[PDB]
Amino acid sequence: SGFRKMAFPSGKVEGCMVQVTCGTTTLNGLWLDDVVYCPRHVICTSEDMLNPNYEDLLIRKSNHNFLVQAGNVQLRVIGHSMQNCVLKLKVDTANPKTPKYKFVRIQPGQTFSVLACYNGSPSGVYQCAMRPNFTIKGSFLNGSCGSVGFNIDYDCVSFCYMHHMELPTGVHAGTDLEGNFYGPFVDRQTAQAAGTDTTITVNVLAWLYAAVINGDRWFLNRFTTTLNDFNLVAMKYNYEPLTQDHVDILGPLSAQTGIAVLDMCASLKELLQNGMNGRTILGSALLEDEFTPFDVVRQCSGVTFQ
Amino acid sequence: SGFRKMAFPSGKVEGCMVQVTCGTTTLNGLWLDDVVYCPRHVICTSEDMLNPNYEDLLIRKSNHNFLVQAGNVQLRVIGHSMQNCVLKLKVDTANPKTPKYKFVRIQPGQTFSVLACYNGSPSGVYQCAMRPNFTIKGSFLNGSCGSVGFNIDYDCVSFCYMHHMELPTGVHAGTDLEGNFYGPFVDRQTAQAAGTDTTITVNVLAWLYAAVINGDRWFLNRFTTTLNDFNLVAMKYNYEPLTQDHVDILGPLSAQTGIAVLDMCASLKELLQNGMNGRTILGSALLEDEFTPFDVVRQCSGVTFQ
Ligand SMILES: *C(=N)[C@H](C[C@@H]1CCNC1=O)NC(=O)[C@H](CC(C)C)NC(=O)c1cc2c(OC)cccc2[nH]1
Ligand SMILES: *C(=N)[C@H](C[C@@H]1CCNC1=O)NC(=O)[C@H](CC(C)C)NC(=O)c1cc2c(OC)cccc2[nH]1
């Protein structure tokens, strides 16, 4: 029993983090096989940062301008290339700890673990959601760039995120491991706006099912609703429209708890309209939206990895 | 910027988790050097837990009744002993992945990372506090006993917790790695009460300092108070009394934010008396008490380990 924001064990990723230095700037990179992946702004100087021409800054640099070290081991760089917003440095030695791995572009509302790193060394791990406006609510300081987010499916690490910037509002933005930003952001020292963020309805409902599985049941009611009528209440309170694909995803949970999806929608509707009344669900006074239905199912059925 | 409940990177601990089988029952153990540590109730049969005589169940068992598996490697058991509520299995081979480590008995209000495991393999990691009533608010299913809690200081893992039971109210209890329970709990299927749980006042203030560091400042006020006067407010509201030791520990944070401890107590008093008014602090509608002052400084100044 109990239910926590839980991250994936980070052993397989800690083994891949290295420090990458170019001139003054140091950040993190990801060492897999014979390639190190790192954010490309490692090649900026404190002036050229307000609008860099990265194709023309990469030209002033040769391999040996790139200092890569795994722990105290220095790696020899034997090639370098730019793909979108990441640099890829070919190194002489292939990471003996390379896990079996995939590169995956994640979808809004999906969750992943972040291993926050500084100077190539892990500091901590936490779970995160890719918000609908393509930001994440993380904990990142100077030097954190190159930190990666990931999921683990059995033995396979799915890398989905590399960290690149903090926006004005204090949320975070970054790329997939192909260097393509999530969202409309660019890697330049400019003030960029994220759009308005809705709440992930399908996740809030999966959390209500976790609550019920764990004994927390005061929010259950006698009522019902329809997908279209609840969706009017979702608009008003800034929740993503709920779809029949979402309904289908909540079904194994609906079928474990004996509570049909649309009656759980009805319980939610009434929490949105009247609030919680100073009570709590799974220890929270707010509606939590960073658990996918998969997360709820992993944590209530006990899925392992190694 | 940002602030999350972060766990320590779990790599050094994953290398130590193994499976321990005694008849029908399988749970987790901790392999360090040539010794495996696991909860002694691995030797109970599904009947005997209501009142076990552990010395007399442990006598019916020989080395070879204990099957240890580290991944797929079966370890040979060459000795066994009971120390308080933990079994110690002497195995022929020393764990090649043994980190530098100590066993530590932590104090109420200190935090630690939990690596939750099943069948000897890691499922996930989250951060936890030892409540004042010596329980923890975790996420543990059947098979999770033997999961351990730990802190990392640079290169040394400090093991502080091994998981043994869930109480009626759905909180959790366990031992230090010498097998002594935190709290008044015993390892038998009996009706056991956690005491009344107070809130960890020194941690709530540490979270308010974190909030201010990160821009959340709306709870700051013009008023002040005294140590004895706020403590009258802490009693009524179920908070542990604040001491000048606590003041002294909150001082480096008071000196980073330019806010003396007693002015921050004053902000808290009025949150306790008036609520939050539908607002949030660091994304929470509740007052968080599972960040120690140390945790706040680790996360706001970016401390690393590996
Ligand atoms: C990576 N090391 C760092 C991570 C930030 C540091 C502070 N918290 C983070 O998450 N990234 C950056 O510093 C990034 C570098 C560019 C060249 C890609 N810049 C920013 O992240 C940045 C610029 C900025 C402005 O205008 C300059 C205004 C508000 C916020 C902001 N953030
Ligand atoms: C260990 N593998 C397991 C962990 C539990 C499983 C369910 N959630 C957990 O945390 N421990 C036990 O099953 C433990 C066995 C020993 C201590 C004999 N028993 C309990 O944890 C337990 C007994 C109990 C009773 O019986 C009076 C009543 C309410 C709750 C409860 N929990």
A185 touches chain B (CB under 8 A): no
The CA B125 to ligand 1 mean position distance, Å, reads 28
Is B165 within 8 Å of B23 (Cβ atoms)? no
Look up tokens 């291993």; give the residue: A115
Strand partners, A35: A32, A90
Tokens of A134: 């393509």
Q: How many CA atoms lie within 13 A of A118 on its CB side?
A: 15
- The radius of gyration computed from the CA coordinates of chain A, to the nearest angstrom, equals 22
Is B140 within 8 Å of B173 (Cβ atoms)? no
Residue by residue, what is the 3-state secondary structure of chain A?
CCCCCCECCCHHHHCCEEEEEECCEEEEEEEECCEEEEEHHHHCCCCHHHCCCHHHHHHHCCHHHEEEEECCEEECEEEEEEECCEEEEEECCCCCCCCCEEECCCCCCCEEEEEEEECCEEEEEEEEECCCCCCECCCCCCCCCCCEEEEEECCEEEEEEEEEEECCCCCEEEECCCCCECCCCCCCCCCCCCCCCCECHHHHHHHHHHHHHCCCCCCCCCCCCCHHHHHHHHHHCCECCCCHHHHHHCHHHHHHHCCCHHHHHHHHHHHHHHCCCCCCECCECCCCCCCCHHHHHHHHHCCCCC
Is B134 within 8 Å of B98 (Cβ atoms)? no
Is A82 within 8 Å of A54 (Cβ atoms)? yes
Is B110 within 8 Å of B93 (Cβ atoms)? no
In 3D space, the residue among B85, B47, B82 whose CA is nearest the CA of residue B66 turns out to be: B82
CB-based contacts of B274, cutoff 8 Å, min separation 6:
none
Proximal ligand: closest to the CA of A181: 1
Strand partners, B151: B158
Cα distance between the two ends of chain A: 23
What is the largest distance, in Å, between two alpha-carbon atoms of chain A? Answer: 69
**Which residue among A6, A121, A306 sits closest to B125, beta carbon to beta carbon?**
A6
CA dist A303 and B117 (Å) reads: 9
A93 touches chain B (CB under 8 A): no
CATH of the domain at A19: 2.40.10.10
CA dist A7 and A299 (Å) reads: 11
Provide the b/e sequence for A166-182 (b: ≥16 CB within 10 Å). Answer: bbeebbbbbbbbebebb
Is B288 within 8 Å of B207 (Cβ atoms)? yes
Strand partners, B85: none
A168 touches chain B (CB under 8 A): no
What's the Cα-to-Cα distance from B86 to each of A165, B32, B35, B159, B181, rounded to whole Å? 47, 14, 12, 14, 10
Q: How many CA atoms lie within 13 A of A207 on its CB side?
A: 20
CA dist B1 and B19 (Å) reads: 40
Look up tokens 């607002």; give the residue: B279
CA dist B255 and B258 (Å) reads: 5
CB-based contacts of B96, cutoff 8 Å, min separation 6:
none
**Which residue among B1, B117, B306 sits closest to A122, beta carbon to beta carbon?**
B306
Give the ligand 1 atom nearest the CA of A50: 27
**Resolution of the experimental model in angstroms, please?**
2.2
Active site residues of B: 41, 145
Strand partners, B129: B111
CA dist B128 and B121 (Å) reads: 20
What's the Cα-to-Cα distance from A287 to each of A133, A137, A283, rounded to whole Å? 18, 16, 11
Residue type, B11: G
CA dist B4 and B125 (Å) reads: 14
CA-nearest residue to B128 within chain A is A4
3-state secondary structure (DSSP) of residue B193: coil
Does A290 sit in the ligand 1 pocket, CB within 6 Å? no
Which sign does the torsion angle of CA A253, A229, B280, A183 carry? positive
CA dist B145 and B40 (Å) reads: 10
Provide the b/e sequence for A131-145 (b: ≥16 CB within 10 Å). Answer: bbbbbbbbbbeebbb
From the candidates A13, A111, A126, A151, which should be mutated to test the interface with B, based on the most B CB atoms within 10 A? A126
Q: Which range of residues forms the domain containing residue B221? A: 201-301
Is B89 within 8 Å of B97 (Cβ atoms)? no
Write the DSSP symbol of residue B37: E
Active site residues of A: 41, 145
The CA B199 to ligand 2 mean position distance, Å, reads 25
Which sign does the torsion angle of CA B300, B304, B305, B306 carry? positive
Residue nearest to atom 8 of ligand 2 (CA): B141
Tokens of A69: 């070290």
- In terms of Cβ atoms closer than 10 Å to its own Cβ (0-12, 13-18, 19+), residue A246 is buried
CATH of the domain at B254: 1.10.1840.10
Method for this entry: X-ray
Q: After which residues does chain A show a gap where C to N exceeds 2.5 Å?
A: none
